[PDB]
Design a protein around this ligand. Sequence first.
Ligand SMILES: O=C(O)CCCC[C@@H]1SC[C@@H]2NC(=O)N[C@@H]21
Ligand SMILES: O=C(O)CCCC[C@@H]1SC[C@@H]2NC(=O)N[C@@H]21
Ligand SMILES: O=C(O)CCCC[C@@H]1SC[C@@H]2NC(=O)N[C@@H]21
Ligand SMILES: O=C(O)CCCC[C@@H]1SC[C@@H]2NC(=O)N[C@@H]21
Lengths: 119, 119, 119, 119
Amino acid sequence: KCNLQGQWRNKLGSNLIIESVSQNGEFTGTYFTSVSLTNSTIRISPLTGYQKLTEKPTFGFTVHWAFSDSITVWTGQCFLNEKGEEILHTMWLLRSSQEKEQDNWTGTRVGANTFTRLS
Amino acid sequence: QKCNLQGQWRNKLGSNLIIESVSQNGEFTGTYFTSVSLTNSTIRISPLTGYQKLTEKPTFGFTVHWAFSDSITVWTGQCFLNEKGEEILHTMWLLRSSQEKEQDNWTGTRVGANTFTRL
Amino acid sequence: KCNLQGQWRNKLGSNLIIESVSQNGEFTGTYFTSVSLTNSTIRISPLTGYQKLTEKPTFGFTVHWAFSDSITVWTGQCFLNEKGEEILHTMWLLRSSQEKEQDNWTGTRVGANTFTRLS
Amino acid sequence: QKCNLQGQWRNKLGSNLIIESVSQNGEFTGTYFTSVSLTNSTIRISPLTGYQKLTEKPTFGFTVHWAFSDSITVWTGQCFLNEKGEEILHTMWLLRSSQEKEQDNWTGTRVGANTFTRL
Ligand SMILES: O=C(O)CCCC[C@@H]1SC[C@@H]2NC(=O)N[C@@H]21
Ligand SMILES: O=C(O)CCCC[C@@H]1SC[C@@H]2NC(=O)N[C@@H]21
Ligand SMILES: O=C(O)CCCC[C@@H]1SC[C@@H]2NC(=O)N[C@@H]21
Ligand SMILES: O=C(O)CCCC[C@@H]1SC[C@@H]2NC(=O)N[C@@H]21
């Protein structure tokens, strides 16, 4: 357990799917967000990242949003909770595209996400 | 120049960021050589993977898979041309350190800014 | 509801007490953390901050830890959940004291906290 | 100088930070005049309250209660003497914007760094 492959959901209802993990820790997959900053139609978006291949692995990944000019990165660690269920504790940075360097200071949001298996 | 991220970059800490040819979909890989680290372990060159947007003044994000520790760092940011026409990467980062227990998770994520320019 | 006065707890088990709120939004109180970075004895610590006096108020405060050289700031907003119970959604920055400016980059942690009334 | 925070400070955005006499317990108040804001509303001088540590190279934190918007910003950081003996405040900040609904909470917190020096 704490295999990162497969499907996960966060408390927002977003879906993270990790398709494969390589021996050097590299992984690829897709992200489907339940929420967004604008009203454009949300589309499945690709991700790439890395995990440690340790007990309780740390990891990070980037999502290249297919429907906006934003990028989000997450980093976190996997643990088993009290019930022995896998949980990914993460923090994220959401970069929005600014028109000019003078507005750069406005361009980065932060938050936490908690991912668990689909019940 | 028009913020194609390919090439050598340096931040104010003196870390070296090297980005390879950006793929048609914006995906890139590269290497990171940090000038600073959390402990006394010898710093080794580390791989990175990420994406950039394909628009003017691109947003981007990437993950560095540290070769010498159990940590992971992610950056996200946006490239602008400064006042001198010179390119500049404005970034924020999250550094995840590996914790031994789920109860210590709250301690595991550092945050900062980095500013990268061409050498 | 969303009066900030009185006692609150977060998921770590920490206790936030807001003693009074003034007409200009200023508030004072104490914080008792259930967790810390070191092994020194945790002691009740003072806080000062401000809230908006609006529906669903935003707020921020600083805790002057009495038992370490750290400082933490929180900012967030109060809402009523589905049950009609008050909830404070917050993000925090924990600054630890560094010995030298060269290590400044290591000195700031980030996370989320969720505060509710004692049940 | 020894990082007593009393006085006038400026950051790279050009915002003005003014801190009054620090009390015996480290508490301070002051005023903040930002050079930049999220919307087109006219910027007004805004009050702040916070604390500094009483040790060499003090950590500190404060909250600004914006007089012209429903937002709140908190900063935390540490004062060092740079290489030129000149004092410098290294900070990170969280800017909370007021959301209309609990469901939009994830959008409500921006993050950045600020660097303050004496005028
Ligand atoms: O709106 C955009 O421009 C892109 C989608 C951003 C969705 C964010 S990423 C952080 C948070 N966690 C999620 O599952 N969705 C939101
Ligand atoms: O110490 C570790 O475990 C890994 C190295 C972390 C170095 C950090 S990443 C953010 C900051 N920017 C840098 O260029 N280096 C440090
Ligand atoms: O260890 C220290 O130096 C001070 C205590 C830090 C406790 C942090 S603040 C963020 C998080 N939320 C809490 O209720 N406690 C921890
Ligand atoms: O626009 C608002 O609603 C309030 C003003 C926010 C200004 C931010 S606070 C962080 C950054 N640093 C500054 O000196 N100004 C901006």
